[PDB]
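Hi W., the calcium ion complex you wanted:
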Amino acid sequence: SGKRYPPGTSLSRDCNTCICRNSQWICSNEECPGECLVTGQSHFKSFDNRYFTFSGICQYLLARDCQDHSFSIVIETVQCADDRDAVCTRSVTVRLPGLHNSLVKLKHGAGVAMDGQDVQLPLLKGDLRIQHTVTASVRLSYGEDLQMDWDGRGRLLVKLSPVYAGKTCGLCGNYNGNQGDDFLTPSGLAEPRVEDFGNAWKLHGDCQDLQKQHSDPCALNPRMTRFSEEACAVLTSPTFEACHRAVSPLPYLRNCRYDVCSCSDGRECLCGALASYAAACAGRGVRVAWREPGRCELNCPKGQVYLQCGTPCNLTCRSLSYPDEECNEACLEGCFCPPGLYMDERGDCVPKAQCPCYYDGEIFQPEDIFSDHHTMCYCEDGFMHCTM
Amino acid sequence: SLSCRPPMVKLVCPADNLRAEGLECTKTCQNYDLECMSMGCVSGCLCPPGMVRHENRCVALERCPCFHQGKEYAPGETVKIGCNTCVCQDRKWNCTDHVCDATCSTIGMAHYLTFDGLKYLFPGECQYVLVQDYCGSNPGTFRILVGNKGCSHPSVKCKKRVTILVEGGEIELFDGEVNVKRPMKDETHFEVVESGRYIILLLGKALSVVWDRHLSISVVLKQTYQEKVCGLCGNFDGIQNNDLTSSNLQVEEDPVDFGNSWKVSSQCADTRKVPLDSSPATCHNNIMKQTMVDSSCRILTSDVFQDCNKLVDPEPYLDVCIYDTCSCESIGDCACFCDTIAAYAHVCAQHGKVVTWRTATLCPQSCEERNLRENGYECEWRYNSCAPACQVTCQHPEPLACPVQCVEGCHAHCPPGKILDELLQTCVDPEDCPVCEVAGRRFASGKKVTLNPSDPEHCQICHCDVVNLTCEACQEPG
Amino acid sequence: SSCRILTSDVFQDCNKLVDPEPYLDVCIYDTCSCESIGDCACFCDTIAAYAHVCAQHGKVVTWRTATLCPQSCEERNLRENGYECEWRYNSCAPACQV
Amino acid sequence: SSTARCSLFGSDFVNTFDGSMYSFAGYCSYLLAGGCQKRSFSIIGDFQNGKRVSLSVYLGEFFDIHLFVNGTVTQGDQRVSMPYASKGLYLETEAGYYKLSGEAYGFVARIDGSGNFQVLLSDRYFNKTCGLCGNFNIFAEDDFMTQEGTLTSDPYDFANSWALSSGEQWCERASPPSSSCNISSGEMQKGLWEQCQLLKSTSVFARCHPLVDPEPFVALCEKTLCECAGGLECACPALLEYARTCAQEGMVLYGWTDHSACSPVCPAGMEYRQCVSPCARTCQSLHINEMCQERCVDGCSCPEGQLLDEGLCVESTECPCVH
Ligand SMILES: *[C@@H]1O[C@H](CO)[C@@H](O)[C@H](O)[C@H]1NC(C)=O
Ligand SMILES: *[C@@H]1O[C@H](CO)[C@@H](O)[C@H](O)[C@H]1NC(C)=O
Ligand SMILES: *[C@@H]1O[C@H](CO)[C@@H](O)[C@H](O)[C@H]1NC(C)=O
Ligand SMILES: *[C@@H]1O[C@H](CO)[C@@H](O)[C@H](O)[C@H]1NC(C)=O
Ligand SMILES: *[C@@H]1O[C@H](CO)[C@@H](O)[C@H](O)[C@H]1NC(C)=O
Ligand SMILES: [Ca+2]
Ligand SMILES: [Ca+2]
Ligand SMILES: [Ca+2]
Ligand SMILES: [Ca+2]
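Structure:
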């Protein structure tokens, strides 16, 4: 990347490692998980690191296990502004044949609905765990080979481990490492026109298929043409200097100008798109401090404080109830409050004195003496001390 | 109410089965293999299980067509994509497995299309390894190179130089013509076809080069290699996202660092990481001009290209159009715009889509001067959309391995009974060709090759310069 | 340099008769202002203007090549499917014929 | 015909190309007209708060003009003088009223002294445009086909579909105004019903009926004769439109303002004529003729002599020289 390294060093990509020996990096080829991403209005990413857009409004098949049928994902897409070139996600449906042949639905809130039933988070069933992440974003976790991300305002993500190498089919491609084959219709042939690909994965015949995927919605709103330039001009500004050599910014810039001219309010459409790039930079190692009072710093409530890179392990009051559980989480970004304070259910965070206990789930007040004939139990400080 | 048609029967949601997949999961031919959601059915009238809906018609059999490009195909109908046929037997397309012949390209001044297909930007000024065979653990037969000068910014400058190193030879080209600095050993495979606007140039069984006389470099490799090469065109493996494997054997994300790994002179000036923007230098803060250039590149999406747009994405080729001609000033000969279109038009021709997009008020391309040397204008040289490249001549009477179907340019058209020779510009009767047929068999017009090296006792050599029915004596080793 | 065709080997006859200096000033002025993206007539025309003035003083000139302002004439003889090719750009041809 | 006509007359009132009026008190810019498949241009009208300020033409991507109530004009943000002719758009004054002509692009816009946007548009755009002035079809009702394309019965949410925001301001849905007329009814409907009525009664208006219908015009006035306190003049805006709307059809009317007791505003030295030629023979003019075969346009102009010289009417004797 235009900088020198001594021999013997072992720099590491996110996927694997590489070592300098005789001016030649040696490298493994071992697989590593892929990600199909939805965001913006209609900007998609394949497993094989393709980018495109398909502003179709129907229940399309996002992804699916295709040699067996461990799961299947179905986006549902909607027009999302006065403009015709503004089609964002409403909801996504997930289907687990492995458990009940149930049907999970991710709702435009942070809400989820299983089989029509609204459900509290966490949702420990046998395999799938559904809990908030920052308390503003849902995360499904089926087994170990699957993740999801919040489909509230439509930023759906996935994590497919390499066990699914090449055996998926949908909008998101094969997950085979090949970026070129990705427009492969269900009838088994690569289509050069995106307008052919997405409409082949709708689930309803009544859905009109489109004919042209416009590139410049800014034409139909000439007012925003000026603004759309300077707005994501910061994307290439040296504010993001540290991860130009981590991921190609040029599409994320392209995906900005489609969104800001398209949506109703370009304020957040801008600042959701910039976070789109920062999230990818962070997913490779590089965090960026790109928030300002002008550049859309969120407003953590008075109980909370903004934080750049922190540990979502010791935050919730539940953690004191289940301390033994592992928290193999990253250094995440969001609204925390200082370490003396732990998060309470009511949006405030509190010291651990009045931090209730969640024994059997049951929300015991901080002082609850509590016992059968045979057991003997109390809630001290967030932990539930049982005996016999 | 309405009693639905006879060919199908009404359904009712049972009160027990949550799986009331009735009207909502109306299976058409598209969504049959696709799995559907359903809360409950409706009071609709759905086809029997043995059939589906088909455009307001419950087509009975599972014979309903196999779509491609949003178009019908009956079962049994075939489609030709690339060098493969492909039939839809039941409902999915069933294709062959003949991998086709890939093709590098230099569309404009500084852009590069890989074999597997990867446009990327790389303004360079040093000499670079376009493609070679000497890659890792191979013999290293051919070493096609490229060298540009004053070509970081596209303009009327940037005359390319190309030096191609095969069979221990040194033949190179620039400035309109080709030059042999060192002839190679096996002259038999050597071949040059100056036809139309191109210099078609074979070098062997599985190698061919094409040159537009101006900038473009379209080398064509056969099925032989299949990951035996590397350079700026990638590896030719089919994998499309591993074409940026630098010479130090690691994928790079930023192509400007990539091609720096492939420069020959390891001490010249490596290029500079440009800040990324949608506007080149001229179009930078020149929004007025920036629209006029934009509209002009929309010929790539015009009524005349509508056939080819469905096959080949114009979007890659558009990006080059806008990039070059902003940077280019296009004062005199405005080829820094005309060429980018011609590049797309030829790719269209390779897929069988000849196009006539060239008018008198846009990139005219006259052909009158060849019909000048004779005092009387016989008028045989006519410019033509895409006339075939591999014909027979006095110099090349035999048919040649023809990597390119047809090509643009001036093409001498005259009635039959006359074969073209380039020295005497017109076409001429066949007998006037200095053609050679020694001891009966049909071959070329006296190639300058010493046949029969293998057996000394059978060293029965017969050259032919132009016409002579001669045979030379072999010098004995003893 | 591009406008120095107006002072080139091919115009040496006409340079002695007609001053090219007025016509040069227009050349540089127009084509700077002009962007000359597609049909680059905002340069080709200024020269053609000078070449005709040269013709009026009896100095026919052939300055037009294939790599500079080509000016084909096939269309006609092309449309003439039966290519009896006749529409040959007769250089500076008598405008007033029968 | 071969032309169209939209009008934003008076306060909040609109006239589409096809005889469909309503009222709208917007809050920001709104697209008046332009292509819908592709836009070579676009006409937008900014509303401060219901009341209008600025007409503007965004010519594709690269050029813009903002002419506004006061009368001053800018290009981008740099205030330019007037007249002004860049990019094939001649920004001129006619009959004391400001004009923007886009004949290359097939439109003519203008404003009067009071502030009344008008758009004459070429028949090249039939069942083609779609904006706030409706489609240039024939149907004088379907002309509410939203930015998605939806026949909406409401004349209000429709206009709010064609909202365009900028970075300087992001605008919302305005609200329909709550009328104070509903309680302050009193005599104001009895004595003042007549000035709306005279569109029908008076003979000078009694002859465009086979061409147009005053019934919407009398309908749209009666709701706006109630907010203004103490004035018969409140009828003449809705009326003044009816004059032009008949005139555009090919049948002009004459001298109607003589007894109407309402003349449209114009600066000193001029008052409202009807059907003055656009080629006002001014002071510093060349005496050429029979090129100005243009159609005849209404507006205020000088007396019989009193040639124009820099926005005022001055006697022909005192024509200056210039150097
Ligand atoms: C493809 O066609 C061949 C030849 O008819 C047949 O043998 C094979 O089963 C087919 N395969 C598929 C996937 O349809
Ligand atoms: C031009 O060449 C094309 C392609 O070879 C051929 O189909 C066509 O007949 C030619 N036309 C003329 C006028 O020679
Ligand atoms: C026609 O053009 C030729 C070649 O330029 C020239 O020699 C000849 O004088 C011209 N004849 C006429 C009639 O203009
Ligand atoms: C009046 O003109 C001034 C100066 O050009 C401008 O700042 C202002 O916005 C105008 N106001 C109105 C109501 O047009
Ligand atoms: C109106 O335009 C639509 C869309 O172009 C077209 O389908 C229809 O025929 C047109 N109708 C009339 C009355 O012109
Ligand atoms: Ca794939
Ligand atoms: Ca490759
Ligand atoms: Ca003479
Ligand atoms: Ca209408």
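The pocket of calcium ion (ligand 7) is lined by residues B 116, 234-235, 237, 239, 242-243 (CB under 6 Å).

W.
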